[PDB]
RNA sequence: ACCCACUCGGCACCUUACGAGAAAUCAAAGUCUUUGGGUUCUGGGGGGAGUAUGGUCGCAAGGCUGAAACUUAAAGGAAUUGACGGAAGGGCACCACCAGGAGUGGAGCCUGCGGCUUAAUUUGACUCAACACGGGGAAACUCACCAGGUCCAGACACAAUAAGGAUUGACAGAUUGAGAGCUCUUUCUUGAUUUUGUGGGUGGUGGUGCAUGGCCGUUCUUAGUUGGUGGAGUGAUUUGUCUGCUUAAUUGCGAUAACGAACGAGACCUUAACCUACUAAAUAGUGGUGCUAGCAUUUGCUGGUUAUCCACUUCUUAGAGGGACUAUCGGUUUCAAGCCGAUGGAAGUUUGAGGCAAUAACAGGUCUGUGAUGCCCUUAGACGUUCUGGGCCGCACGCGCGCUACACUGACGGAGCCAGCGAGUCUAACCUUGGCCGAGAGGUCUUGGUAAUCUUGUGAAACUCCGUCGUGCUGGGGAUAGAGCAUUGUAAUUAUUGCUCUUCAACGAGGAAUUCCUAGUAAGCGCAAGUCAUCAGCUUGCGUUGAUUACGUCCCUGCCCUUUGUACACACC
């Protein structure tokens, strides 16, 4: 045939990171629980899922992409 | 046309460890039995065998 | 000298075969396992090799006598069937001539092939039997190519990761051709569906048609294949299956150690031809009557009225039948098969044209039709797949199929006006009459038709008729090209197609060569169908107009058939 070329630099993938995440759930000196990071209000995800915090950003994750409430 | 009327063709592809091979089967059914359709080849021309006569004999007549 | 009969001894042939042989053959090559007349000579698988060595002969060249080592499963004889010949005798054929026709070959463009060019210009096929072929008329798709971007649709097993999360997704931004969360920024999400690894799978228009199936093409516009009883031969085998004649035919007649058959040809099937004979029909049509228009008027002539009734089946349609069997007569030939001519007949060239079609062969073509397939290669930076854009159309040039033409049997413009094969819309927009609008192309408003019912009588074109032009590259011819309008489509630029104005090329009948064709055929003419969103200068069919010249032959060619040779048989590659 011919076989092989490339200007090199092979595309990686997606690491998806690790994290021991959902630490955000602050409970004080026994045993009161006030959550951290405000949650979404779309009836598909009944206020269990929360919102990411970037700049200008309160983003809904479970809503795979959708709905952009902001404050 | 007897082809259509009588013989039966079939092709079958049997495939084995070494390659494949084809089976071509032909069956000519007895035109005699036939049941429905022509009972004989267009070729066929049977002549019916007559009869030895005992002719001669002077006329005469018979009444009923 | 000749004739005739006979007899010795000769050079030979003929027919036979009791007999011999492996056979071809042989009056010896017979009288030979039923093995003995006398005698001289030679041979003991092939090659090594008539070589080496010695002896002898000769001027010489060389003659006679004459080993072994080693190697080798065969070499060889006669015959049989096949295959082949750059060997002989016959045939057949418009993919062969003749006698002619219409051409191609020259021109413009259309189109395939090569060549070149190219990021790529995907590829199979190269004499008949490759090159308007792959149904191959590519804007995307198709698509196999090139520049680039995603996705896994990697079943399954073991193992490893890990419920503190194995894994999925993504808003905006950066980025990308791209409103791809491909990637990264940031950080919500999801829950054991995935990930990594091994084995094992799979997809692939990747390779191999020189591994295969099937299919197709070719030999073949051919006439060949076989078996029963019998004859010949130890046999493989041969005769049947043949000199001639005769057919399109191993089609027949005839000759005859052959007789009577079977596949194939023929039969058969399909279509065009005939049917005032049968069955019929508002999805076909006719005659009459109603109803009604026009012109005549004297009755008439020419139309209208998807049912106003009644009748019919010539035309139309398709069911069952009939009909031709080269008939009747007569020429001609082995007075056989047949062939020729007249007559009759819807039709007498296998009635015209097709469908099928035995045995055998080719390394013909097809892994680019198949979820037909062996093997090999590839399988995640993919040769899988999908998305964007380009390309198969690229142009000094060679070749093949074509299309349009060089005009006056013509172009133009009026006007006359006639076919047959088709096809058309359900989970959809196909065939489209009709009414308006526009020079046109086309737009628009409705309509019939899933169809003998509607498009549609498909009012097609050559063609017919009356003009205009008047032989001048002319008003023949329409290439190239500029400008504007429309249609198909997500998209038309390298210009899909259609329209209008202008531009007005080559080509003044075409070298050597070469294709096709014998009657409603040739050629001229346009349709319909395939392909198809749009595109025919292509093809498959179809009807329209309708000639000339044979009715012969073996000269060119191509192929069959015997005879003959053969050391071929993997068969002259
Ligand atoms: Zn939400």
XYZ file of C-alpha atoms (C1' of nucleotides) and ligand atoms in Angstrom:
709
model
C 0.000 0.000 0.000
C 2.104 2.859 1.421
C 1.937 2.684 5.233
C 2.253 5.504 7.776
C 2.814 9.311 7.739
C 1.812 11.714 10.572
C 3.151 15.182 11.570
C 3.135 13.579 15.045
C 1.402 14.495 18.335
C -1.218 11.753 18.819
C -4.567 12.818 20.318
C -5.044 11.672 23.919
C -8.554 11.109 25.291
C -10.345 12.291 28.411
C -9.017 11.698 31.930
C -12.355 12.441 33.668
C -10.199 13.142 36.787
C -10.523 11.240 40.084
C -11.480 13.173 43.271
C -13.095 11.809 46.437
C -15.671 14.524 45.628
C -18.976 15.384 47.329
C -17.342 16.821 50.437
C -19.731 19.744 50.061
C -22.301 19.056 52.799
C -21.044 20.991 55.852
C -22.311 19.679 59.193
C -21.327 21.618 62.310
C -20.657 20.568 65.913
C -23.225 17.726 66.067
C -25.074 17.316 64.015
C -26.811 20.011 61.985
C -26.416 19.770 58.197
C -26.361 22.773 55.855
C -25.516 21.859 52.273
C -22.852 23.514 50.150
C -23.260 24.572 46.475
C -26.843 25.509 45.533
C -28.977 22.887 43.756
C -30.988 22.869 40.510
C -34.791 23.046 40.387
C -35.693 21.187 37.191
C -38.347 18.535 38.029
C -36.296 15.884 36.183
C -33.750 16.043 39.002
C -35.630 16.616 42.254
C -33.209 18.980 44.024
C -30.713 16.194 44.674
C -28.232 17.316 42.045
C -26.376 20.578 42.557
C -24.712 23.317 40.517
C -21.088 23.813 39.531
C -19.456 27.106 40.488
C -17.390 28.815 37.802
C -17.358 32.500 36.869
C -20.808 33.833 35.872
C -21.716 30.194 36.359
C -24.253 28.088 38.175
C -24.467 25.102 35.850
C -26.726 22.049 36.014
C -24.860 18.764 35.575
C -27.523 16.031 35.621
C -29.452 18.070 33.150
C -26.673 16.752 30.901
C -26.161 20.300 29.636
C -29.411 22.110 30.027
C -30.647 25.173 31.930
C -28.444 28.048 33.027
C -29.685 29.745 36.192
C -27.262 32.380 37.459
C -26.601 34.457 40.583
C -40.949 -26.496 -22.591
C -40.908 -30.048 -21.082
C -38.073 -28.625 -18.947
C -40.637 -26.495 -17.142
C -43.082 -29.388 -17.219
C -40.823 -32.126 -15.841
C -37.219 -31.558 -14.690
C -36.382 -29.945 -11.357
C -33.216 -27.887 -10.785
C -31.603 -26.904 -7.470
C -28.331 -25.173 -6.556
C -26.939 -25.464 -3.008
C -23.766 -23.925 -1.587
C -22.212 -26.201 1.000
C -19.271 -24.605 2.792
C -16.504 -26.495 4.591
C -13.121 -26.111 6.298
C -11.259 -25.942 2.958
C -13.574 -23.688 0.916
C -17.028 -24.111 -0.593
C -18.591 -26.408 -3.179
C -21.844 -26.350 -5.114
C -24.507 -29.015 -5.534
C -26.535 -28.931 -8.756
C -29.418 -31.436 -8.589
C -31.685 -32.399 -11.494
C -34.804 -34.592 -11.203
C -36.891 -35.660 -14.205
C -40.291 -36.854 -12.933
C -42.303 -39.526 -14.765
C -44.415 -37.814 -17.461
C -46.696 -40.836 -17.350
C -48.068 -40.291 -13.832
C -48.433 -36.540 -14.462
C -51.836 -36.155 -12.710
C -52.285 -32.542 -13.836
C -50.708 -31.283 -17.055
C -49.572 -33.233 -20.161
C -49.020 -36.946 -19.497
C -46.449 -37.450 -22.260
C -43.587 -35.885 -24.235
C -44.490 -33.932 -27.382
C -42.091 -36.459 -28.942
C -44.428 -39.332 -28.095
C -46.639 -40.891 -30.784
C -48.309 -44.159 -29.749
C -49.924 -46.234 -32.501
C -52.866 -48.337 -31.290
C -52.567 -51.956 -32.335
C -55.520 -52.994 -34.595
C -57.065 -56.458 -34.805
C -56.777 -59.620 -36.875
C -60.005 -59.841 -38.833
C -61.908 -63.000 -39.787
C -63.403 -61.525 -43.011
C -64.786 -63.348 -46.069
C -68.220 -64.969 -45.376
C -71.144 -64.598 -47.818
C -73.445 -61.613 -46.886
C -76.691 -62.436 -44.960
C -78.671 -60.208 -42.559
C -79.956 -60.332 -38.969
C -83.333 -59.291 -37.527
C -84.247 -57.970 -34.073
C 7.612 -63.842 -84.399
C 3.021 -64.702 -81.950
C -1.074 -68.355 -79.672
C -2.352 -72.443 -76.317
C -1.456 -76.453 -72.718
C 2.327 -78.630 -69.618
C 7.157 -78.917 -66.844
C 11.801 -77.449 -64.513
C 14.613 -73.158 -62.312
C 13.962 -67.708 -61.732
C 12.710 -61.776 -60.349
C 7.818 -60.396 -58.276
C 2.504 -59.436 -57.264
C -2.530 -61.252 -56.002
C -6.197 -63.509 -52.679
C -6.341 -66.209 -48.684
C -5.341 -68.303 -43.814
C -5.453 -74.270 -41.652
C -1.260 -71.904 -38.799
C 2.148 -67.783 -36.220
C 2.764 -63.132 -33.751
C 2.864 -58.386 -28.726
C 0.956 -56.329 -32.593
C 2.074 -54.094 -37.349
C 2.247 -58.270 -40.102
C 4.226 -63.232 -42.114
C 3.964 -69.062 -47.346
C 7.554 -68.091 -43.504
C 8.164 -64.797 -39.427
C 4.045 -72.000 -40.516
C 4.422 -77.336 -39.233
C 6.776 -74.410 -31.044
C 4.592 -76.537 -23.671
C 1.503 -82.042 -28.594
C 8.423 -77.961 -26.675
C 14.433 -82.299 -30.598
C 16.374 -82.420 -39.231
C 21.828 -80.599 -39.488
C 24.777 -76.503 -38.440
C 27.597 -71.271 -38.017
C 26.822 -66.405 -35.394
C 24.961 -62.837 -31.866
C 21.908 -60.888 -27.545
C 20.657 -61.114 -21.542
C 17.376 -53.557 -18.073
C 18.927 -48.360 -19.291
C 23.142 -45.034 -19.067
C 28.316 -45.001 -18.191
C 30.376 -46.490 -23.792
C 32.067 -48.667 -28.247
C 34.516 -44.966 -23.488
C 39.368 -46.625 -20.591
C 43.410 -50.187 -20.836
C 46.415 -53.726 -23.423
C 47.272 -56.363 -28.277
C 47.230 -56.146 -33.555
C 46.460 -53.628 -38.445
C 47.336 -48.613 -41.231
C 51.409 -43.462 -44.023
C 47.518 -40.960 -41.709
C 42.346 -40.514 -40.835
C 41.373 -44.594 -38.326
C 40.018 -50.467 -38.399
C 39.519 -55.002 -35.494
C 39.590 -57.122 -30.341
C 37.376 -54.514 -25.799
C 36.452 -53.473 -19.698
C 35.320 -51.546 -15.131
C 34.166 -47.828 -11.102
C 29.770 -45.049 -10.681
C 24.884 -44.004 -11.734
C 19.778 -45.185 -12.814
C 13.314 -47.391 -12.542
C 12.814 -47.366 -16.077
C 14.654 -47.051 -21.597
C 12.170 -49.548 -25.376
C 8.545 -52.129 -29.189
C 3.565 -52.543 -31.702
C -1.228 -50.667 -31.494
C -5.699 -47.199 -29.509
C -8.041 -42.945 -28.366
C -7.252 -37.938 -28.035
C -4.560 -33.096 -28.868
C -1.738 -30.315 -32.468
C 0.659 -29.080 -37.592
C 4.104 -23.242 -40.727
C 0.839 -31.402 -44.488
C -3.508 -32.948 -48.487
C -8.990 -33.180 -50.106
C -13.626 -31.266 -48.825
C -17.558 -27.983 -47.016
C -20.361 -23.687 -44.289
C -21.126 -18.453 -43.300
C -22.804 -11.030 -45.170
C -19.399 -11.335 -37.217
C -16.603 -14.193 -45.508
C -16.494 -12.242 -50.502
C -19.454 -11.224 -54.880
C -23.501 -7.328 -56.633
C -24.965 -3.117 -54.248
C -26.760 0.139 -50.384
C -26.122 3.439 -45.872
C -21.771 4.723 -43.806
C -17.432 5.175 -40.526
C -12.196 6.674 -41.386
C -11.318 13.740 -42.709
C -14.485 18.130 -39.753
C -17.238 20.340 -34.727
C -18.975 18.513 -30.371
C -20.687 14.017 -27.325
C -18.594 9.880 -25.125
C -15.364 5.685 -23.258
C -9.826 3.979 -23.425
C -4.508 5.391 -23.274
C -1.215 9.039 -22.407
C 0.194 13.096 -19.684
C -1.162 16.190 -15.501
C -2.375 15.504 -10.369
C -3.017 16.343 -2.829
C -6.394 12.787 -5.516
C -7.344 12.731 -10.557
C -10.626 5.180 -7.032
C -10.850 0.595 -10.146
C -11.973 -4.072 -13.168
C -11.573 -5.196 -18.686
C -6.890 -4.664 -23.847
C -7.766 -9.176 -31.044
C -12.821 -11.507 -32.813
C -14.513 -12.523 -27.179
C -11.280 -4.806 -23.900
C -12.467 0.877 -25.243
C -22.087 4.248 -25.157
C -18.645 -2.317 -21.071
C -19.396 -3.156 -15.223
C -26.650 -1.739 -16.437
C -20.564 3.043 -14.869
C -26.092 9.404 -17.575
C -20.297 10.647 -10.256
C -22.787 18.383 -7.957
C -23.897 15.727 -1.977
C -25.025 10.695 -1.503
C -23.156 6.954 -4.818
C -17.367 6.376 -3.326
C -13.743 2.568 -3.636
C -9.407 8.539 -4.201
C -7.242 12.904 -1.970
C -6.981 17.262 2.592
C -8.965 17.000 7.196
C -12.725 15.742 11.785
C -15.847 12.160 15.037
C -17.581 7.363 16.628
C -17.059 1.731 18.180
C -21.720 -0.396 16.382
C -13.893 -4.121 19.767
C -19.999 -10.380 20.919
C -17.756 -13.443 24.566
C -14.129 -15.761 28.625
C -10.468 -15.092 32.394
C -8.098 -11.426 34.836
C -7.089 -6.272 36.708
C -9.561 -1.377 38.458
C -13.325 -0.012 41.709
C -19.119 1.278 45.433
C -14.264 6.327 49.413
C -16.888 5.438 42.495
C -15.577 0.872 37.281
C -17.663 4.485 33.796
C -21.306 8.363 30.806
C -22.667 13.233 29.612
C -22.054 18.743 29.259
C -23.518 24.788 29.693
C -19.962 29.160 28.122
C -15.082 29.936 26.847
C -10.601 28.671 24.301
C -10.330 25.790 20.048
C -12.523 23.633 14.991
C -15.000 24.143 8.403
C -18.598 23.330 11.842
C -24.169 25.067 17.511
C -18.050 18.102 17.683
C -17.477 19.106 25.348
C -12.727 15.987 19.405
C -9.400 18.602 22.916
C -8.408 21.806 27.153
C -10.171 25.801 31.201
C -13.647 25.306 35.320
C -17.028 21.189 38.045
C -21.561 19.738 38.097
C -23.211 14.806 36.619
C -23.899 9.611 36.106
C -23.868 4.488 38.787
C -21.177 -0.870 37.605
C -24.451 -0.457 31.457
C -18.325 0.936 31.113
C -12.704 1.132 31.400
C -7.226 -1.442 31.067
C -5.084 -6.155 29.789
C -5.051 -11.236 27.621
C -7.185 -14.599 24.693
C -11.027 -14.557 21.321
C -14.273 -11.936 17.869
C -15.899 -8.709 14.222
C -16.245 -5.151 10.117
C -13.673 -4.128 5.574
C -15.739 -1.788 -2.747
C -8.310 -4.425 1.428
C -5.463 -8.712 -1.542
C -5.927 -13.494 -4.310
C -11.310 -14.775 -10.458
C -3.956 -18.450 -10.505
C -7.753 -20.936 -3.918
C -13.580 -21.486 -4.620
C -19.405 -21.416 -5.331
C -22.748 -19.363 -8.381
C -23.324 -16.478 -12.591
C -21.824 -15.049 -17.195
C -19.100 -14.917 -21.986
C -16.529 -17.894 -25.739
C -15.803 -22.286 -28.906
C -21.099 -22.274 -31.490
C -24.706 -17.942 -37.263
C -21.899 -25.121 -34.089
C -23.802 -30.482 -34.879
C -22.184 -33.279 -31.786
C -22.911 -37.422 -27.299
C -24.361 -42.375 -25.944
C -26.064 -47.257 -24.999
C -28.869 -52.933 -26.323
C -28.384 -57.336 -29.480
C -24.980 -58.602 -33.427
C -19.804 -58.624 -36.576
C -14.048 -57.566 -35.937
C -9.804 -57.405 -32.320
C -5.917 -61.062 -26.566
C -6.798 -55.991 -25.756
C -7.197 -50.513 -25.092
C -10.865 -50.226 -29.109
C -13.605 -50.546 -33.653
C -18.426 -51.152 -36.826
C -23.456 -48.782 -35.713
C -21.488 -43.029 -35.910
C -20.404 -44.465 -43.934
C -17.889 -42.782 -50.392
C -22.328 -40.285 -52.456
C -26.536 -37.395 -52.534
C -29.826 -34.021 -49.655
C -31.146 -30.329 -45.623
C -30.492 -24.836 -41.371
C -29.261 -29.575 -39.030
C -25.491 -37.138 -37.173
C -31.741 -33.199 -41.515
C -32.890 -37.156 -44.366
C -32.437 -40.794 -48.622
C -29.196 -44.342 -50.167
C -24.918 -47.580 -49.987
C -24.061 -51.230 -46.225
C -21.975 -56.209 -40.929
C -24.745 -54.081 -39.049
C -29.883 -53.946 -36.822
C -33.382 -51.244 -33.810
C -33.070 -46.872 -30.260
C -32.059 -42.588 -26.418
C -29.809 -37.139 -25.142
C -28.874 -32.933 -28.587
C -31.371 -30.805 -33.676
C -36.777 -31.547 -34.567
C -40.916 -31.795 -31.253
C -42.287 -27.938 -27.575
C -43.064 -23.092 -25.582
C -43.791 -17.279 -26.758
C -45.151 -13.468 -30.119
C -46.852 -11.260 -35.014
C -50.272 -13.175 -39.138
C -56.117 -15.735 -40.673
C -61.663 -16.645 -38.273
C -69.060 -11.740 -40.846
C -67.577 -19.318 -37.293
C -68.611 -20.090 -30.572
C -68.768 -17.220 -25.743
C -69.436 -11.905 -24.517
C -68.826 -6.635 -22.832
C -70.929 1.764 -19.956
C -63.649 0.089 -18.384
C -64.497 -1.765 -26.143
C -67.128 -0.185 -30.292
C -71.205 -0.136 -34.118
C -76.309 0.571 -36.104
C -81.477 2.820 -34.672
C -84.249 5.887 -31.552
C -85.024 9.830 -28.354
C -82.695 15.145 -27.355
C -80.243 19.107 -29.956
C -76.854 22.725 -33.460
C -75.334 24.149 -38.367
C -76.027 24.220 -43.653
C -79.539 22.837 -47.120
C -83.990 22.706 -47.496
C -87.463 17.914 -51.177
C -86.035 13.293 -48.118
C -80.607 15.141 -47.010
C -75.313 16.299 -45.545
C -71.938 17.396 -40.916
C -71.608 17.345 -35.305
C -73.330 17.452 -29.948
C -75.801 14.579 -25.772
C -69.869 8.737 -20.122
C -76.480 5.769 -19.575
C -82.447 8.671 -22.610
C -83.867 3.744 -24.260
C -83.583 -0.745 -27.848
C -80.599 -3.831 -30.773
C -75.926 -5.756 -32.248
C -70.359 -8.025 -32.015
C -67.928 -6.286 -38.698
C -63.825 -3.175 -36.128
C -61.545 -3.540 -30.211
C -60.629 -6.897 -26.236
C -59.223 -12.563 -24.546
C -61.091 -17.505 -23.397
C -62.017 -22.475 -26.002
C -61.514 -24.069 -30.906
C -60.427 -24.358 -36.217
C -56.352 -23.411 -39.753
C -50.684 -25.414 -43.259
C -49.419 -30.664 -43.776
C -44.347 -26.738 -48.253
C -51.373 -28.611 -50.399
C -52.886 -29.409 -56.031
C -50.632 -29.920 -60.708
C -46.139 -30.028 -63.154
C -40.760 -29.640 -63.978
C -35.584 -32.080 -62.072
C -32.419 -35.540 -59.625
C -29.670 -42.402 -58.422
C -37.438 -40.728 -60.512
C -34.997 -41.783 -53.338
C -34.542 -37.683 -49.852
C -35.532 -33.467 -51.639
C -35.203 -28.991 -54.660
C -37.469 -25.581 -58.708
C -42.049 -23.382 -61.037
C -47.212 -22.337 -61.738
C -52.110 -22.301 -58.995
C -54.746 -21.734 -54.711
C -54.256 -19.715 -50.026
C -54.212 -15.299 -43.748
C -49.589 -17.106 -44.497
C -45.550 -21.812 -48.379
C -37.380 -18.645 -46.970
C -37.521 -23.878 -39.996
C -44.658 -19.279 -42.077
C -41.675 -14.236 -40.041
C -39.031 -13.142 -35.153
C -37.600 -15.042 -30.418
C -37.407 -18.349 -25.758
C -35.100 -22.792 -24.469
C -30.869 -25.958 -25.930
C -26.784 -32.121 -24.906
C -21.279 -33.685 -24.136
C -16.606 -31.162 -23.638
C -13.131 -27.060 -23.094
C -10.870 -21.626 -21.355
C -6.547 -20.986 -15.470
C -12.122 -15.944 -20.610
C -14.817 -12.271 -16.842
C -16.947 -11.387 -11.981
C -14.035 -11.897 -4.209
C -16.483 -3.702 -6.949
C -24.145 -7.577 -6.541
C -24.699 -10.808 -2.347
C -25.143 -11.637 5.337
C -22.013 -16.785 -1.262
C -16.813 -18.238 0.433
C -10.927 -20.722 1.651
C -6.507 -18.330 2.700
C -3.669 -13.861 3.563
C -3.686 -8.552 5.140
C -5.891 -4.763 8.133
C -8.917 -3.846 13.137
C -8.717 2.081 17.185
C -3.124 7.633 14.833
C -8.770 1.634 11.395
C -7.775 -0.414 5.174
C -14.176 -0.321 10.170
C -17.841 3.610 9.973
C -19.684 8.427 9.808
C -19.054 14.176 8.973
C -16.743 18.681 5.843
C -14.366 19.981 1.320
C -12.240 18.301 -3.190
C -11.681 14.553 -7.071
C -13.123 10.557 -10.726
C -15.085 15.922 -15.737
C -8.426 17.555 -14.497
C -5.339 18.739 -21.009
C 0.773 19.482 -25.831
C -1.521 14.662 -27.662
C -2.872 8.815 -29.784
C -7.283 5.404 -30.367
C -12.785 3.273 -30.380
C -18.664 3.979 -30.008
C -21.270 8.124 -31.493
C -24.073 13.094 -32.400
C -24.536 17.282 -35.844
C -23.303 18.791 -40.711
C -21.270 20.523 -45.489
C -27.528 22.395 -48.141
C -31.978 23.540 -53.515
C -34.885 14.991 -53.082
C -32.571 21.929 -49.064
C -33.124 25.780 -44.602
C -36.788 28.889 -43.150
C -42.249 30.359 -42.140
C -47.080 29.369 -42.467
C -50.571 25.408 -43.074
C -52.211 20.131 -43.669
C -52.032 16.105 -39.998
C -50.931 10.309 -38.710
C -48.607 5.809 -34.963
C -47.265 1.449 -31.806
C -44.480 -0.687 -27.458
C -44.967 1.714 -22.217
C -45.604 3.981 -17.145
C -47.900 6.357 -13.508
C -49.795 8.870 -5.819
C -50.065 5.039 0.972
C -49.131 5.729 4.599
C -47.979 10.167 -0.759
C -47.119 14.091 -3.872
C -46.520 9.916 -9.455
C -48.739 10.479 -14.405
C -51.482 15.429 -14.921
C -56.084 17.395 -18.820
C -58.562 21.927 -17.963
C -58.831 28.038 -16.426
C -56.116 32.177 -16.063
C -50.580 34.970 -16.159
C -45.971 35.266 -19.228
C -42.243 36.053 -25.781
C -40.354 32.028 -23.716
C -38.953 28.738 -20.145
C -42.163 28.505 -16.467
C -45.772 30.376 -12.556
C -50.469 29.990 -10.630
C -56.014 28.187 -9.692
C -58.432 23.474 -9.989
C -59.258 18.331 -11.988
C -59.427 13.096 -13.645
C -56.802 8.735 -12.860
C -53.891 2.920 -8.177
C -55.947 3.133 -14.465
C -58.792 -0.682 -21.173
C -62.354 4.059 -17.269
C -57.712 9.625 -16.307
C -52.999 11.953 -18.488
C -54.010 10.099 -23.941
C -56.682 9.683 -30.066
C -49.982 10.129 -26.089
C -53.031 15.760 -32.505
C -44.531 12.324 -32.274
C -41.143 13.188 -36.318
C -39.593 12.486 -40.797
C -43.639 13.473 -44.269
C -47.902 16.341 -47.356
C -49.297 21.175 -49.039
C -48.480 27.274 -50.306
C -44.899 30.646 -49.638
C -39.804 33.022 -48.749
C -34.890 32.616 -50.023
C -31.630 31.425 -55.139
C -26.177 29.029 -55.274
C -22.795 33.026 -53.040
C -18.419 29.598 -46.377
C -25.814 31.944 -48.255
C -31.023 32.728 -45.005
C -26.493 25.812 -45.484
C -23.827 24.757 -40.798
C -24.068 25.788 -35.235
C -18.889 25.390 -32.659
C -16.759 28.983 -29.369
C -18.432 32.977 -26.356
C -20.837 37.610 -23.521
C -25.175 39.105 -21.328
C -30.340 38.344 -18.882
C -34.737 35.013 -17.097
C -36.397 30.440 -15.059
C -36.569 25.028 -13.069
C -34.424 20.517 -9.943
C -32.147 20.448 -5.526
C -29.381 21.710 1.480
C -26.067 23.162 -2.416
C -25.407 24.306 -9.434
C -18.694 28.298 -9.071
C -15.160 23.868 -12.653
C -20.674 26.924 -15.378
C -27.066 20.018 -13.730
C -31.161 21.322 -17.285
C -34.597 24.727 -19.780
C -35.425 29.981 -21.965
C -34.354 34.929 -24.837
C -30.713 38.438 -27.549
C -26.020 38.715 -29.599
C -21.080 36.429 -31.229
C -21.460 33.101 -36.923
C -15.819 28.631 -36.184
C -14.412 23.810 -38.693
C -16.808 21.274 -42.358
C -17.095 22.565 -50.438
C -18.446 14.471 -49.827
C -13.413 13.464 -47.098
C -5.991 9.290 -47.627
C -4.572 4.452 -46.637
C -7.802 1.521 -44.427
C -12.804 -0.520 -42.184
C -18.171 -1.821 -39.826
C -23.393 -3.386 -40.758
C -26.968 -5.300 -43.903
C -31.009 -9.566 -48.525
C -38.073 -7.209 -47.474
C -41.965 -3.846 -44.561
C -35.329 -5.992 -44.105
C -31.639 -1.487 -45.185
C -31.537 3.298 -44.132
C -34.261 7.934 -42.867
C -37.932 9.487 -38.579
C -39.715 10.316 -33.688
C -41.483 8.026 -29.212
C -41.872 5.041 -24.611
C -39.254 2.439 -21.052
C -34.616 1.686 -18.080
C -31.315 5.049 -15.431
C -33.811 9.639 -12.831
C -34.555 15.029 -7.323
C -32.403 17.463 -11.733
C -29.446 15.471 -16.545
C -29.485 11.103 -23.394
C -25.729 13.079 -28.145
C -26.695 5.769 -24.379
C -29.346 1.509 -24.405
C -33.874 -1.890 -24.424
C -38.059 -2.110 -27.109
C -41.749 0.443 -30.484
C -44.267 2.037 -34.458
C -43.945 5.709 -38.788
C -41.817 6.494 -44.306
C -39.858 2.842 -47.166
C -35.484 1.671 -51.691
C -31.251 -0.348 -54.509
C -28.667 -5.252 -55.295
C -27.948 -11.248 -54.686
C -30.632 -15.580 -54.554
C -24.481 -16.945 -56.342
C -19.594 -18.627 -55.041
C -14.655 -20.350 -52.296
C -10.949 -15.307 -54.190
C -9.762 -12.605 -49.351
C -11.085 -14.215 -44.060
C -13.101 -17.201 -40.106
C -14.425 -21.954 -38.673
C -16.024 -27.077 -39.164
C -15.011 -32.020 -41.423
C -12.194 -36.298 -43.143
C -7.078 -38.039 -44.826
C -1.944 -38.060 -42.897
C 2.344 -37.351 -39.304
C 3.648 -37.165 -34.283
C 9.117 -38.558 -29.858
C 2.781 -34.263 -27.553
C -1.230 -36.648 -23.424
C 0.247 -30.878 -17.652
C -1.518 -32.387 -24.871
C 2.444 -26.633 -29.290
C 1.499 -21.747 -23.727
Zn -31.261 20.639 36.086
